[PDB]
Design a protein around this nucleic acid. Sequence first.
DNA 1: TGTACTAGTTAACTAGTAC
DNA 2: TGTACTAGTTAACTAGTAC
Lengths: 99, 104
Amino acid sequence: AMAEERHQEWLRFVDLLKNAYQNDLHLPLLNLMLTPDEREALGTRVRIVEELLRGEMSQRELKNELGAGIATITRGSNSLKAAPVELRQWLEEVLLKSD
Amino acid sequence: SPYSAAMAEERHQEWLRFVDLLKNAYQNDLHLPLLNLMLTPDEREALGTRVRIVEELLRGEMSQRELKNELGAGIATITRGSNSLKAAPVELRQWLEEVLLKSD
DNA sequence: TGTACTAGTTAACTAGTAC
DNA sequence: TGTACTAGTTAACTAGTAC
Protein backbone atom coordinates (compact mmCIF):
# COMPACT_ATOMS: atom_id res chain seq x y z
CA ALA A 1 0.00 0.00 0.00
CA MET A 2 3.08 2.14 -0.56
CA ALA A 3 1.02 2.33 -3.75
CA GLU A 4 -2.05 3.96 -2.18
CA GLU A 5 0.38 6.58 -0.95
CA ARG A 6 2.04 7.16 -4.29
CA HIS A 7 -1.48 7.60 -5.66
CA GLN A 8 -2.35 10.49 -3.37
CA GLU A 9 0.91 12.17 -4.40
CA TRP A 10 0.07 11.70 -8.13
CA LEU A 11 -3.26 13.54 -7.44
CA ARG A 12 -1.20 16.33 -5.86
CA PHE A 13 0.91 16.59 -9.05
CA VAL A 14 -2.36 16.96 -11.12
CA ASP A 15 -3.31 19.87 -8.90
CA LEU A 16 0.15 21.55 -9.13
CA LEU A 17 0.03 21.22 -12.89
CA LYS A 18 -3.39 22.85 -13.03
CA ASN A 19 -1.92 25.81 -11.10
CA ALA A 20 1.11 25.98 -13.44
CA TYR A 21 -1.08 26.28 -16.56
CA GLN A 22 -2.77 29.27 -14.79
CA ASN A 23 0.62 31.05 -14.35
CA ASP A 24 2.16 30.23 -17.70
CA LEU A 25 4.75 27.85 -16.12
CA HIS A 26 3.36 24.54 -17.49
CA LEU A 27 6.20 24.06 -20.00
CA PRO A 28 9.07 24.48 -17.50
CA LEU A 29 7.08 22.31 -15.00
CA LEU A 30 6.73 19.52 -17.58
CA ASN A 31 10.42 19.73 -18.60
CA LEU A 32 11.36 19.25 -14.91
CA MET A 33 8.92 16.41 -14.21
CA LEU A 34 9.17 14.23 -17.36
CA THR A 35 12.15 12.83 -19.25
CA PRO A 36 12.77 13.46 -22.98
CA ASP A 37 11.69 9.89 -23.85
CA GLU A 38 8.41 10.19 -21.91
CA ARG A 39 7.57 13.46 -23.74
CA GLU A 40 8.18 11.72 -27.14
CA ALA A 41 6.02 8.72 -26.16
CA LEU A 42 3.13 11.05 -25.11
CA GLY A 43 3.32 12.86 -28.49
CA THR A 44 2.90 9.44 -30.13
CA ARG A 45 -0.08 8.26 -28.02
CA VAL A 46 -2.01 11.46 -29.04
CA ARG A 47 -1.49 10.57 -32.74
CA ILE A 48 -2.68 7.04 -32.12
CA VAL A 49 -5.90 8.05 -30.31
CA GLU A 50 -6.65 10.73 -32.95
CA GLU A 51 -6.36 8.31 -35.92
CA LEU A 52 -8.30 5.47 -34.18
CA LEU A 53 -11.11 7.98 -33.62
CA ARG A 54 -10.94 9.28 -37.27
CA GLY A 55 -11.34 5.70 -38.59
CA GLU A 56 -9.97 6.20 -42.11
CA MET A 57 -7.00 3.82 -41.79
CA SER A 58 -6.93 0.14 -40.67
CA GLN A 59 -4.82 -0.53 -37.51
CA ARG A 60 -2.20 -2.21 -39.71
CA GLU A 61 -2.00 0.93 -41.95
CA LEU A 62 -1.70 3.16 -38.86
CA LYS A 63 1.16 1.18 -37.28
CA ASN A 64 3.11 1.35 -40.57
CA GLU A 65 2.47 5.13 -40.79
CA LEU A 66 3.80 5.59 -37.25
CA GLY A 67 6.57 2.97 -37.38
CA ALA A 68 4.90 1.58 -34.23
CA GLY A 69 4.27 -1.99 -32.98
CA ILE A 70 0.68 -3.24 -33.48
CA ALA A 71 0.50 -3.84 -29.69
CA THR A 72 0.87 -0.08 -29.11
CA ILE A 73 -2.22 0.59 -31.31
CA THR A 74 -4.05 -2.13 -29.39
CA ARG A 75 -3.18 -0.32 -26.12
CA GLY A 76 -4.73 2.84 -27.51
CA SER A 77 -7.82 0.91 -28.64
CA ASN A 78 -8.28 -0.78 -25.27
CA SER A 79 -7.74 2.53 -23.40
CA LEU A 80 -10.43 4.29 -25.50
CA LYS A 81 -12.93 1.41 -24.70
CA ALA A 82 -12.34 2.05 -20.98
CA ALA A 83 -12.77 5.87 -21.16
CA PRO A 84 -16.08 7.53 -20.35
CA VAL A 85 -18.37 8.21 -23.33
CA GLU A 86 -18.22 11.98 -22.61
CA LEU A 87 -14.42 11.98 -23.00
CA ARG A 88 -14.54 10.09 -26.33
CA GLN A 89 -17.17 12.51 -27.71
CA TRP A 90 -15.03 15.50 -26.43
CA LEU A 91 -11.91 14.12 -28.18
CA GLU A 92 -13.82 13.65 -31.48
CA GLU A 93 -14.96 17.28 -31.29
CA VAL A 94 -11.49 18.71 -30.48
CA LEU A 95 -9.19 16.46 -32.55
CA LEU A 96 -11.33 16.11 -35.66
CA LYS A 97 -11.79 19.88 -36.11
CA SER A 98 -13.22 23.20 -34.97
CA ASP A 99 -11.31 23.96 -31.82
CA SER B 1 17.92 20.70 -41.80
CA PRO B 2 17.17 17.90 -44.26
CA TYR B 3 18.01 15.56 -41.38
CA SER B 4 18.46 14.84 -37.70
CA ALA B 5 17.83 18.35 -36.40
CA ALA B 6 14.55 18.51 -38.32
CA MET B 7 13.42 15.15 -36.98
CA ALA B 8 13.90 16.34 -33.40
CA GLU B 9 11.81 19.42 -34.19
CA GLU B 10 8.86 17.24 -35.30
CA ARG B 11 8.84 15.12 -32.13
CA HIS B 12 8.85 18.43 -30.34
CA GLN B 13 5.70 19.63 -32.17
CA GLU B 14 3.86 16.33 -31.46
CA TRP B 15 4.61 16.86 -27.76
CA LEU B 16 3.33 20.44 -27.83
CA ARG B 17 0.09 18.93 -29.17
CA PHE B 18 -0.29 16.85 -25.99
CA VAL B 19 0.36 20.02 -23.92
CA ASP B 20 -2.42 21.88 -25.73
CA LEU B 21 -4.93 19.06 -25.54
CA LEU B 22 -4.33 18.79 -21.76
CA LYS B 23 -4.80 22.52 -21.30
CA ASN B 24 -8.22 22.30 -23.04
CA ALA B 25 -9.08 19.25 -20.86
CA TYR B 26 -8.46 21.26 -17.63
CA GLN B 27 -10.76 24.05 -18.98
CA ASN B 28 -13.51 21.46 -19.42
CA ASP B 29 -12.97 19.43 -16.22
CA LEU B 30 -11.89 16.34 -18.29
CA HIS B 31 -8.24 16.43 -17.18
CA LEU B 32 -8.48 13.30 -15.02
CA PRO B 33 -10.11 10.94 -17.53
CA LEU B 34 -7.68 12.33 -20.14
CA LEU B 35 -4.63 11.56 -17.97
CA ASN B 36 -6.09 8.09 -17.07
CA LEU B 37 -6.28 7.44 -20.85
CA MET B 38 -2.89 8.84 -21.83
CA LEU B 39 -0.65 7.49 -19.00
CA THR B 40 -0.11 4.00 -17.51
CA PRO B 41 -0.60 3.25 -13.78
CA ASP B 42 3.21 2.76 -13.29
CA GLU B 43 3.72 6.18 -14.94
CA ARG B 44 1.26 7.99 -12.58
CA GLU B 45 2.96 6.37 -9.54
CA ALA B 46 6.44 7.42 -10.70
CA LEU B 47 5.27 11.03 -11.09
CA GLY B 48 3.92 10.89 -7.55
CA THR B 49 7.43 9.91 -6.28
CA ARG B 50 9.16 12.68 -8.36
CA VAL B 51 6.89 15.40 -6.93
CA ARG B 52 7.67 14.25 -3.36
CA ILE B 53 11.43 14.38 -4.08
CA VAL B 54 11.26 17.89 -5.62
CA GLU B 55 9.24 19.11 -2.56
CA GLU B 56 11.65 17.59 0.02
CA LEU B 57 14.78 18.83 -1.88
CA LEU B 58 13.25 22.33 -1.83
CA ARG B 59 12.49 22.10 1.88
CA GLY B 60 16.16 21.27 2.62
CA GLU B 61 15.48 19.75 6.08
CA MET B 62 16.37 16.13 5.19
CA SER B 63 19.70 14.88 3.84
CA GLN B 64 19.62 13.02 0.47
CA ARG B 65 20.34 9.64 2.14
CA GLU B 66 17.50 10.38 4.55
CA LEU B 67 15.12 11.13 1.68
CA LYS B 68 16.08 7.92 -0.15
CA ASN B 69 15.46 5.75 2.94
CA GLU B 70 12.06 7.39 3.58
CA LEU B 71 10.82 6.71 0.02
CA GLY B 72 12.43 3.31 -0.56
CA ALA B 73 14.22 4.97 -3.53
CA GLY B 74 17.67 4.65 -5.11
CA ILE B 75 19.89 7.67 -4.34
CA ALA B 76 20.33 8.02 -8.14
CA THR B 77 16.61 9.06 -8.43
CA ILE B 78 17.19 11.75 -5.78
CA THR B 79 20.22 12.93 -7.88
CA ARG B 80 18.05 13.17 -10.99
CA GLY B 81 15.72 15.43 -8.98
CA SER B 82 18.67 17.55 -7.81
CA ASN B 83 20.24 17.97 -11.25
CA SER B 84 16.84 18.78 -12.77
CA LEU B 85 16.11 21.50 -10.18
CA LYS B 86 19.56 22.93 -10.97
CA ALA B 87 18.62 23.18 -14.66
CA ALA B 88 15.17 24.83 -14.06
CA PRO B 89 14.46 28.53 -14.72
CA VAL B 90 14.69 30.76 -11.63
CA GLU B 91 11.07 31.73 -12.08
CA LEU B 92 9.90 28.08 -11.76
CA ARG B 93 12.00 27.54 -8.64
CA GLN B 94 10.58 30.67 -7.01
CA TRP B 95 6.99 29.59 -7.80
CA LEU B 96 7.52 26.03 -6.50
CA GLU B 97 8.95 27.28 -3.20
CA GLU B 98 5.96 29.57 -3.03
CA VAL B 99 3.33 26.86 -3.65
CA LEU B 100 4.68 23.58 -2.26
CA LEU B 101 6.76 24.81 0.66
CA LYS B 102 4.12 26.32 2.90
CA SER B 103 0.92 25.06 1.29
CA ASP B 104 2.45 21.74 0.23
C1' DT C 1 27.56 15.54 3.38
C1' DG C 2 26.48 15.76 -2.59
C1' DT C 3 27.05 13.40 -6.52
C1' DA C 4 29.39 10.31 -10.15
C1' DC C 5 29.63 5.57 -10.88
C1' DT C 6 28.63 -0.05 -10.99
C1' DA C 7 25.06 -3.82 -11.04
C1' DG C 8 20.32 -6.17 -11.88
C1' DT C 9 15.08 -5.07 -12.25
C1' DT C 10 10.99 -3.60 -14.58
C1' DA C 11 7.45 -2.30 -18.12
C1' DA C 12 6.51 0.32 -22.65
C1' DC C 13 8.37 -0.16 -26.72
C1' DT C 14 9.16 -2.41 -32.04
C1' DA C 15 8.80 -6.74 -34.72
C1' DG C 16 6.15 -10.43 -35.88
C1' DT C 17 2.34 -14.51 -35.38
C1' DA C 18 -2.45 -16.87 -34.12
C1' DC C 19 -7.00 -16.87 -34.68
C1' DT D 1 -10.24 -7.06 -40.29
C1' DG D 2 -9.24 -6.45 -34.68
C1' DT D 3 -6.88 -8.26 -30.87
C1' DA D 4 -4.52 -11.82 -27.91
C1' DC D 5 -0.23 -13.60 -28.12
C1' DT D 6 5.77 -14.53 -28.47
C1' DA D 7 10.32 -12.46 -28.84
C1' DG D 8 14.14 -8.95 -27.78
C1' DT D 9 15.29 -3.81 -26.60
C1' DT D 10 15.17 0.47 -24.05
C1' DA D 11 15.41 3.48 -20.05
C1' DA D 12 13.95 4.72 -15.28
C1' DC D 13 14.12 2.39 -11.52
C1' DT D 14 16.19 0.09 -6.63
C1' DA D 15 20.46 -1.28 -4.31
C1' DG D 16 25.05 -0.39 -3.40
C1' DT D 17 30.07 2.02 -3.99
C1' DA D 18 33.77 5.56 -4.52
C1' DC D 19 35.31 10.13 -3.89
